[PDB]
Amino acid sequence: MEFAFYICGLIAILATLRVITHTNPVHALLYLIISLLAISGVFFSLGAYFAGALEIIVYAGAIMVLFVFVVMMLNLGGSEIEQERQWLKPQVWIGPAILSAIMLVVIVYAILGVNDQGIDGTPISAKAVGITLFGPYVLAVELASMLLLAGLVVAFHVGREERAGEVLSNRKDDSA
Amino acid sequence: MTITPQNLIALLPLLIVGLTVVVVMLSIAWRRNHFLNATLSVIGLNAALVSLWFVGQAGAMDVTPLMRVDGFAMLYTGLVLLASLATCTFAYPWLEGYNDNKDEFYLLVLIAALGGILLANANHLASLFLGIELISLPLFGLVGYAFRQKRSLEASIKYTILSAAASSFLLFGMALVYAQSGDLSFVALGKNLGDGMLNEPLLLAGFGLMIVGLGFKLSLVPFHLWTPDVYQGAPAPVSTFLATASKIAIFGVVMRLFLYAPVGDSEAIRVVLAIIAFASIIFGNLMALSQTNIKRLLGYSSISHLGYLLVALIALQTGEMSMEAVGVYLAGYLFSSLGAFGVVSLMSSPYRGPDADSLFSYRGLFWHRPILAAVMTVMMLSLAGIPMTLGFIGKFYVLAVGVQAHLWWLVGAVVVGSAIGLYYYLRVAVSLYLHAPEQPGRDAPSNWQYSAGGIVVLISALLVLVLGVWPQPLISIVRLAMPLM
Amino acid sequence: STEVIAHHWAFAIFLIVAIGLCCLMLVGGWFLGGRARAARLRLSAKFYLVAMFFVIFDVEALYLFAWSTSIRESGWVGFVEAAIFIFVLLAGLVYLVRIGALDWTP
Amino acid sequence: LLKRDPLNSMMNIPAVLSRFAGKGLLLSENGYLRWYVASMSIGAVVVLALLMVLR
Amino acid sequence: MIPLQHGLILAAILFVLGLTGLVIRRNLLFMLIGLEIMINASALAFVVAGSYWGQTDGQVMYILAISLAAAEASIGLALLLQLHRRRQNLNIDSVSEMRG
Ligand SMILES: CCCCCCCCCCCCCCCCCC(=O)OC[C@H](COP(=O)(O)OCCN)OC(=O)CCCCCCCCCCCCCCCCC
Ligand SMILES: [Cl-]
């Protein structure tokens, strides 16, 4: 459990850094999937068996698939932005990095001053979560369907193509 | 708690709007019909407004651990339903010129309204988190409904990315609050802390990260840079909803949170909220002083009006008029905003591409659209807070709550901010009666649907004036709508 | 119990041997055997929509999975709640099919 | 000397400062979204820092 | 046993890394990717907290969070498609016409 938490916790931080600093979009997504698998191990180490599985079933097996689909559809990668590698230029990342560092320091300070009896790791099952979802949190599940419906309707409205054909040519203003 | 037959009556508004979302979607499935689908949406939203009567007769009750139905919930539910019916009446004339799928607009307005009703009854952090997303995700599509327009796409991309960032700060903050509390209910946030121990570092840090998310949605400095760009890019019908429903729905849940949460009476949070209010009141008016775009001007205006409301929140744990002030102020802001944004919608309908957003377009409105100029004048005076308008009665409440709470720096800001505001509000008002010989103005549509929008902005102006001279009726209703403490 | 510890080690070894076996076969192919000395276009968003629909429906199925393992404990109230959820899902599916968003051929 | 009402010009300073401040504040309204995101980052650090120094 | 503080620090590191990514990258794709790191980090914190208190509420909040991430990424990538189809450019700095 302890090894799993620290090893997976470290695999995640290292992979996440590779993602934000990578030039190749697909490689960045690969390191992002690696970090999601690492976070799934952290979830399992803490006893969150349901969250654990969902981390791989929905986040690294659906949301990420959609991202790869888009990168492969628009043939992303090798763009002037990813060729200039501006993010690597120190004058571009030093400022943002310092703001993030100060935010982390302040947050960590607050965390270090909290009561900590420790996380036992007793497994919380998906059955227990389901009893809660269809018991005290019933309105959440019903309204969550409406939220996903809104995503479906909006994504279709702005994501639908006006030009028919599996292969389309990139025209300015998508002129037909 | 479980869902008893009695609990189900208190959910009528949420259940009716939800059923409307389904029936309208099944109607679009059967056959796209702009008139029928718009009509079905309006009928469902009205039915929900009428159901509020039955909810009131039933009485205050906590349906589940996530929702508490009381007078406050009914009042804010009514406000969101009114601002949403208006959005629909203003959309039909505009969507008539939209040569593309138009039934989905009403479908999204309904789901966003469901978010506001949830936020009105929200008594749990989960409800707060879900309600904001139910009122934000539909708006991403509404702000970018005319994706073919460059400004509408820019507005949608800006809102989506910034709202997503704001939702992560909110969730992370709620997680840190949970790590210290152990309960996600508002009444338990700060309850486990002992005497003089309320300022627990992590509890304060969680609230601080939650304020970044809530402050963004309420366009409060320093999370306000998005307001002018999104308000201008979003289609005019949508701008009306973003300026009214979202702000009123989210400001209300924040009031309930700082009222029920024991940590709400933290001086550190109060002093931080006070700096945000002062900046929002001064920065909003100062940035609107030189605006030549009415949409951007009304954006900066929202920054200041929300700053005025925050003063009542800062004086919440010191008086009882604080809740009454916000109710009266938000009622006035609703009618005043529906009036100004609605006139912009009618002058931008039918959709012909870019909206009439330049102040030059309104430089002789009276000599073409007399009643529309008169309404805009009344709303400009109301938003300025000029006695004889409901806007002033809202400002009076804020100043009274502030004085009773000795918020002298904030009361001084309201006076300086209002003085700065008079310059731009009056400029837009007097402009309507100037003579613009240049007439590139488009002819008004001639259908009862367009005339209905004109009635909405007219009735809203009449209410702003009648309640501006005789406010006791509204004061009595808002006083009945009190949270179940 | 030694049983749970034994199963923990067995699962780890199975996973390590499985991935190790694949690497062995791949590295063997690379080593064993000799070797000769030696933008304008895009794919339709119809591919994205299918993936996006999959994501929405897959996340919706998560709730039904949690209900499935706890149907008896949730009782008839839970059934009524799930029924409403499944109806909304089917209603959206009907909408997608009727608007033609679910027909690959134009 | 007083032909141009000097005291009125003195009472117009509150309005000259206002216009100037407005133009300076509008300089942060560059349409750049990355700046808007950085603005929220800066705001978060300031809010959290104040909450800890006022705790 | 894992210290609750260690779990919360892991989430904070992944949150600040995701934010840094959203500000230093001009590509809309890398900005959307950065947001996914931020929302996943917030969901991880809820699971850590729920595990410390032994409550299913942490996993219930995680499910609501991943549902938003799925819906937000769906709409987010749809806007990216529209921008690419019309401007064949993902530099967010170019999407800055409205200002002042
Ligand atoms: C007769 C049947 C057929 C007709 C149906 C009705 C038709 C109209 C429907 C639309 C409007 C509905 C508004 C209903 C308001 C009255 C609700 C009510 O029952 O009021 C009393 C209620 C407390 O009732 P109870 O708990 O039974 O009292 C026990 C006392 N021992 O106390 C409350 O709950 C307080 C209610 C007032 C505050 C909330 C108001 C919400 C609705 C308005 C929102 C907008 C506000 C701004 C309006 C500005 C107008 C200028
Ligand atoms: Cl008229």
UniProtKB/Swiss-Prot annotation, chain A:
Name the source organism: Escherichia coli (strain K12)
Q: Which UniProt keywords apply?
A: Cell inner membrane, Cell membrane, Membrane, NAD, Quinone, Translocase, Transmembrane, Transmembrane helix, Ubiquinone
State its role. Answer: NDH-1 shuttles electrons from NADH, via FMN and iron-sulfur (Fe-S) centers, to quinones in the respiratory chain. The immediate electron acceptor for the enzyme in this species is believed to be ubiquinone. Couples the redox reaction to proton translocation (for every two electrons transferred, four hydrogen ions are translocated across the cytoplasmic membrane), and thus conserves the redox energy in a proton gradient.
GO cellular component terms, A-Z: membrane; NADH dehydrogenase complex; plasma membrane; respiratory chain complex I
Pfam families linked: Oxidored_q3
UniProt topological domain (Periplasmic) ranges: 49-53, 113-137
Where in or outside the cell? Cell inner membrane
Class of enzymatic activity (EC top level):
translocase
Q: Which family does it belong to?
A: Belongs to the complex I subunit 6 family.
Q: Which reaction does it catalyse?
A: a quinone + NADH + 5 H(+)(in) = a quinol + NAD(+) + 4 H(+)(out)
Q: How does it sit in the membrane?
A: Multi-pass membrane protein
Q: What is this protein called?
A: NADH-quinone oxidoreductase subunit J
Q: Reply yes or no: does the keyword Membrane apply.
A: yes
User: How is the subunit organization of this protein annotated in UniProt?
Assistant: Composed of 13 different subunits. Subunits NuoA, H, J, K, L, M, N constitute the membrane sector of the complex.
Gene Ontology biological process terms in this record? respiratory electron transport chain
Transmembrane feature ranges: 1-21, 28-48, 54-74, 92-112, 138-158
GO MF annotations, alphabetized: NADH dehydrogenase (ubiquinone) activity; quinone binding
Chain ranges sitting on the Cytoplasmic side read 22-27, 75-91, 159-176
EC number assigned by the record: 7.1.1.-
From Swiss-Prot, chain C:
The UniProt entry's coiled-coil ranges are none
Under the subunit heading, UniProt states:
NDH-1 is composed of 13 different subunits. Subunits NuoA, H, J, K, L, M, N constitute the membrane sector of the complex.
Gene Ontology terms: biological process: respiratory electron transport chain
- Designated name of the protein: NADH-quinone oxidoreductase subunit A
Which superkingdom is the protein from? Bacteria
Indicate the enzyme's highest-level EC class. translocase
**Which organism encodes this protein?**
Escherichia coli (strain K12)
Gene this protein is translated from: nuoA
Keyword terms, alphabetized: Cell inner membrane, Cell membrane, Membrane, NAD, Quinone, Translocase, Transmembrane, Transmembrane helix, Transport, Ubiquinone
- GO MF annotation terms: NADH dehydrogenase (ubiquinone) activity; NADH:ubiquinone reductase (non-electrogenic) activity; quinone binding
Reaction(s) catalysed by this chain, per the record, are: a quinone + NADH + 5 H(+)(in) = a quinol + NAD(+) + 4 H(+)(out)
Swiss-Prot record, chain D:
Residues assigned to the Periplasmic compartment are 50-55
Cellular localization per UniProt: Cell inner membrane
What sections of the protein cross the membrane?
A: 32-49
Subunit text: Composed of 13 different subunits. Subunits NuoA, H, J, K, L, M, N constitute the membrane sector of the complex.
Entry function? NDH-1 shuttles electrons from NADH, via FMN and iron-sulfur (Fe-S) centers, to quinones in the respiratory chain. The immediate electron acceptor for the enzyme in this species is believed to be ubiquinone. Couples the redox reaction to proton translocation (for every two electrons transferred, four hydrogen ions are translocated across the cytoplasmic membrane), and thus conserves the redox energy in a proton gradient.
In the record, the note on similarity to other proteins reads: Belongs to the complex I subunit 5 family.
Query: Any idea what this protein is called?
Result: NADH-quinone oxidoreductase subunit L
Query: What species does this protein belong to?
Result: Escherichia coli (strain K12)
Q: What is the lineage of its organism?
A: Bacteria, Pseudomonadati, Pseudomonadota, Gammaproteobacteria, Enterobacterales
Record gene name: nuoL
UniProtKB/Swiss-Prot annotation, chain E:
Organism domain of life:
Bacteria
Periplasmic-side stretches of the chain, per the record, are 1-3, 49-59
Q: Which UniProt keywords apply?
A: Cell inner membrane, Cell membrane, Membrane, NAD, Quinone, Translocase, Transmembrane, Transmembrane helix, Transport, Ubiquinone
Q: Which Gene3D superfamilies does the record cross-reference, listed alphabetically?
A: 1.10.287.3510
Query: Which Pfam families does the record associate with it?
Result: Oxidored_q2 (PF00420)
For this protein, the record's InterPro entries field holds: NADH_UbQ_OxRdtase_chain4L/K (IPR001133), NUOK/Mnh_C1-like (IPR039428)
Cysteines paired by S-S bonds: none
**Catalytic activity reported:** a quinone + NADH + 5 H(+)(in) = a quinol + NAD(+) + 4 H(+)(out)
Which residue spans belong to the Cytoplasmic compartment? 25-27, 81-100
State the GO CC annotations: membrane; NADH dehydrogenase complex; plasma membrane; respiratory chain complex I
* Gene Ontology molecular functions: NADH dehydrogenase (ubiquinone) activity; NADH:ubiquinone reductase (non-electrogenic) activity; quinone binding
Where would you find the membrane-spanning parts of this chain?
Answer: 4-24, 28-48, 60-80
Location comes to: Cell inner membrane
Q: How does it sit in the membrane?
A: Multi-pass membrane protein
Q: Which PANTHER family match?
A: NADH-UBIQUINONE OXIDOREDUCTASE CHAIN 4L (PTHR11434:SF16), NADH-UBIQUINONE OXIDOREDUCTASE SUBUNIT ND4L (PTHR11434)
Quote the protein name from its UniProt record.
Answer: NADH-quinone oxidoreductase subunit K
